[PDB]
């Protein structure tokens, strides 16, 4: 009896997991190449005197 319902469930999960894998493949393939920068501030610390430019 249950062959048709089994096949229907199988095809449903197959298509869903298919779309899912189409996503997760290139998801995991590139998941560290997507980093960012540090954004540090100088805080005017590395100068031991007056600047050479006109602003100081």
């Amino acid at each position: 009896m249950q062959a048709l319902l089994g096949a229907r469930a199988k095809e449903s999960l197959d298509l869903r997991a298919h779309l899912k894998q189409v996503k997760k493949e290139d998801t995991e393939k590139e998941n560290r190449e997507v980093g960012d920068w540090r954004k540090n501030i100088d805080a005017l610390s590395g100068m031991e005197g007056r600047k050479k430019k006109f602003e100081s």
Binding site: Q2, L5, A9, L13
Partner: protein, 57 residues
Amino acid sequence: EEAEKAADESERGMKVIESRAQKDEEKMEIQEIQLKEAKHIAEDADRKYEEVARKLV
């Protein structure tokens, strides 16, 4: 992500068994119809039994 994924896997499990419950609900309903009809016939065949058996007599 893993807990949600677990939730999704748990829903996927659930959807197979919810779908199974539904397949069984559908089969039950089909079978309920077949029961009222199988029993309808049990009775109808007996109704006809009596109509024909009465004619037999």
